[PDB]
Amino acid sequence: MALGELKDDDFEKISELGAGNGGVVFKVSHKPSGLVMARKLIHLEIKPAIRNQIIRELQVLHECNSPYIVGFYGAFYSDGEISICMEHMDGGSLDQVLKKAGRIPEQILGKVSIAVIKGLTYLREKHKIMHRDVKPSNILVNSRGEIKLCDFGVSGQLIDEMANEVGTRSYMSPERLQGTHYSVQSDIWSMGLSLVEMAVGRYPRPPMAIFELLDYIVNEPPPKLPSAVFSLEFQDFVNKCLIKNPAERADLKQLMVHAFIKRSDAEEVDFAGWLCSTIGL
Ligand SMILES: Nc1ncnc2c1ncn2[C@@H]1O[C@H](COP(=O)(O)OP(=O)(O)CP(=O)(O)O)[C@@H](O)[C@H]1O
Ligand SMILES: O=C(c1ccc(F)c(F)c1Nc1ccc(I)cc1F)N1CC(O)C1
Ligand SMILES: [Mg+2]
C-alpha cells in the first residue's frame, strides 16, 4: 500500500489539536514515513466482527480525492479506540476560528460557501456520501487558505454505532427532527445554519432548554440574518438553505449558481492572510 499497515507505535504525539463530545485529536508524527497527520481516536466498545467491518468500510476514504475534502491516510483499531489518520489542517476548524474572531465576515463566508457546496457535491456525485453533521467544527482551514470538509459519514456502521453514544441534535433540520430519514436536503439546512452562526458569532436561536429547542425548530420559523448589515444576496442564500419544508429547500445545483456564490467567485479574498492575522499563524 501507499502507507501499508498502521500501528500506533509509529506515531509520536506532537500537540493536542482539540477534542469534543466523542474523543480527542492530536497532531502526530508518523515516524517511519515523515508524514504529519491529525489523529482522531474514537472510543467505541464493539464486537470485533463489527469493528473490522468499520476499519474496512473506512478504506473507502482513500478514494476521496478533492481539494475540498480533508485527505485520508488510513484507519487502524488499537486497544479500544478506532483511529482515523487524516490530513493535518494547521488552522483548526471554523469553530476555533469563530472563538478567536468573534464573527466571520460575509466575504470570507462566501468562500466557505463555495468550499461546502463543492465539497458536498464531490461526495454526493463521486461517492454518494451525504455529509451527516455539517457544522462549523467539521469544516477545517489551513494557512494556505484552503477550506476542506471532514467527519462526513462514509461508513454505514460507524454511523450506526454512533447513533448510540446523541448528536448535534441542534443542527438537525426540522424534518430530520420530526423523524425523517437523512436526505441531502438536511446537509443544506445545516450548512445554512452554520453560516448564520458564524456570521452572527453565536448559535442563531433564542436560548432555551434543549428539549424546548428541538420542538422550537420544528414549530417556529427559521433563523434569518440581521438584515441591515449583510448583503441582500447573502440573506437570500442562507434563506434558501433554510426553508423548513425539505421539498422547497434549494439544492446543490440551484445553490452553486446563486447570486451570492457567483459574486463570491469573482471576489479576491486573501483568506489565507486574514486567518494568520486572526488566530496568529
Ligand atoms: N484534520 C484535522 N486537522 C486539524 N485539527 C483537527 C482535525 N480534525 C479535528 N481537529 C480539531 O480538533 C477539534 C475536535 O474535533 P472533533 O471532531 O473531535 O470534535 P468537534 O470539534 O467536531 C465537536 P463534537 O465533538 O461536538 O462533534 C476540531 O474542532 C478541530 O479543531
Ligand atoms: O468522526 C465522525 C465520523 C462519523 C462517521 C464516519 F463514517 C466518519 F468517518 C467519521 N470520521 C471521519 C470522517 C472523514 C474524515 I477525512 C475524517 C474523520 F475523522 N463524526 C461524525 C460526527 O460529526 C463526528
Ligand atoms: Mg467533528
Side-chain angles (χ1 to χ4, degrees):
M1 279 279 287
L3 263 170
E5 252 214 332
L6 314 159
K7 104 187 174 180
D8 83 296
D9 227 354
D10 309 326
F11 301 92
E12 181 250 272
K13 293 179 182 179
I14 287 153
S15 47
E16 205 198 356
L17 287 171
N21 301 319
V24 57
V25 169
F26 302 100
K27 195 177 177 209
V28 294
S29 177
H30 186 242
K31 193 182 178 183
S33 84
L35 285 172
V36 188
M37 322 176 177
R39 183 201 189 160
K40 162 129 173 224
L41 318 76
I42 297 163
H43 184 133
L44 287 179
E45 211 181 71
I46 39 159
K47 293 281 182 179
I50 276 188
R51 97 149 55 62
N52 289 293
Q53 204 213 180
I54 289 176
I55 282 156
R56 146 273 283 259
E57 259 177 6
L58 288 189
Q59 311 301 311
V60 180
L61 276 187
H62 280 114
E63 306 140 35
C64 281
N65 176 190
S66 162
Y68 308 107
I69 300 317
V70 197
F72 184 56
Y73 288 139
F76 63 108
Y77 158 61
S78 110
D79 203 301
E81 34 207 16
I82 292 204
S83 249
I84 296 174
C85 301
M86 75 209 258
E87 171 182 1
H88 153 252
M89 309 281 292
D90 70 318
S93 78
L94 291 184
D95 193 71
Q96 281 145 336
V97 173
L98 191 47
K99 273 152 167 153
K100 324 259 38 272
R103 286 192 254 83
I104 298 182
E106 165 169 348
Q107 285 81 217
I108 307 255
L109 293 174
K111 296 283 167 212
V112 170
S113 302
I114 287 162
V116 189
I117 318 269
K118 277 194 161 132
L120 294 201
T121 295
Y122 172 98
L123 299 186
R124 180 149 115 214
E125 283 161 0
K126 244 295 127 37
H127 290 284
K128 295 171 83 138
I129 292 155
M130 266 168 193
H131 185 302
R132 280 214 111 87
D133 195 14
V134 184
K135 74 176 136 167
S137 73
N138 295 339
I139 315 179
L140 318 174
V141 301
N142 60 38
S143 104
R144 278 199 290 263
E146 308 203 275
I147 299 151
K148 328 265 204 89
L149 302 173
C150 74
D151 296 2
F152 42 109
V154 236
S155 163
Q157 190 59 44
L158 225 210
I159 284 169
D160 271 352
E161 293 299 315
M162 213 143 181
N164 23 101
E165 264 176 282
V166 111
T168 350
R169 323 162 96 357
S170 58
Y171 279 68
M172 318 182 168
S173 68
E175 61 267 354
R176 181 67 200 173
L177 283 193
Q178 302 155 91
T180 295
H181 294 133
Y182 210 97
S183 105
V184 265
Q185 288 309 81
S186 273
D187 280 321
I188 273 136
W189 174 272
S190 297
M191 179 181 60
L193 198 77
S194 296
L195 291 168
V196 171
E197 163 151 348
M198 303 181 275
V200 309
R202 53 168 284 274
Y203 187 61
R205 288 277 219 194
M208 54 200 85
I210 194 45
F211 286 88
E212 282 152 29
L213 195 32
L214 309 203
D215 308 315
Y216 198 93
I217 299 160
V218 161
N219 299 326
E220 307 310 307
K224 287 236 161 187
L225 282 153
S227 78
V229 295
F230 296 105
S231 83
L232 280 167
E233 296 82 30
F234 197 14
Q235 286 178 72
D236 213 46
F237 196 63
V238 170
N239 284 186
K240 266 192 192 62
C241 282
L242 280 177
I243 277 82
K244 315 188 64 206
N245 153 28
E248 275 164 299
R249 207 166 290 150
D251 59 19
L252 295 186
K253 197 171 184 176
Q254 296 189 331
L255 291 194
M256 196 52 253
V257 306
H258 193 276
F260 173 71
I261 301 303
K262 312 184 195 293
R263 180 202 79 225
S264 301
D265 248 344
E267 269 158 28
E268 194 188 329
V269 177
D270 174 36
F271 163 55
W274 176 89
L275 189 43
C276 311
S277 167
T278 346
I279 75 144
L281 239 166

